[PDB]
Amino acid sequence: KLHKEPATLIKAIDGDTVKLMYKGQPMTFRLLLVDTPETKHPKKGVEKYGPEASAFTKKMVENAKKIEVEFDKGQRTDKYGRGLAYIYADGKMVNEALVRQGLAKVAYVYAPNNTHEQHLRKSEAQAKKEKLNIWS
Structure with a gap:
């Protein structure tokens, strides 16, 4: 079964990376x-809603009392050495929060x-249904 582990914020870097x-x-x-628009995208330079998705991940992890990481069932780091996880700020999953806001x-x-793929596609279909941000 998946389990949550404690972590401490050092720095938010982009909407999809902390x-x-x-x-x-x-x-x-x-x-x-999740794929967020980027401020540090290797090829195209600062995409639309990249500032907004960055500020949203940043405000959510910086205002949290407790951050927790939840690894999934497969590999835990990608080819760049980054941990691959669902991140929770006071019990709310940052990955889902971003998708729900478009x-x-x-x-x-x-x-x-x-x-959590099905849980996230459900929130994306609701943000699309509400025409939010990416979907406006």
Whole structure:
């Protein structure tokens, strides 16, 4: 079964990436299953809603009492050495919060790292139905 573990915020970096202190080590985490517009996109420069998705992830992790990370069933780090996880701020999943506001799209999903896929597609269909941000 998946389980939540404690972590401490070091720094929010982009809408889809945050640096955390996890088991005493600084680590960069990539939020599982979501694609946000980027401020640090390697090719196209600062995409539309990239500032907004960055500010939303930033305000959510910085105002949290407790941050928790939840790894999925498969690999826990990507090829860049980033941890792949669902991140929770006071019990609310940041990955879902972004999708529900139309500040993220559900990514191309890779099994077995796909446990919350259906939960996120449901929130994306609601943000699209409400014509929010990305979907306006």
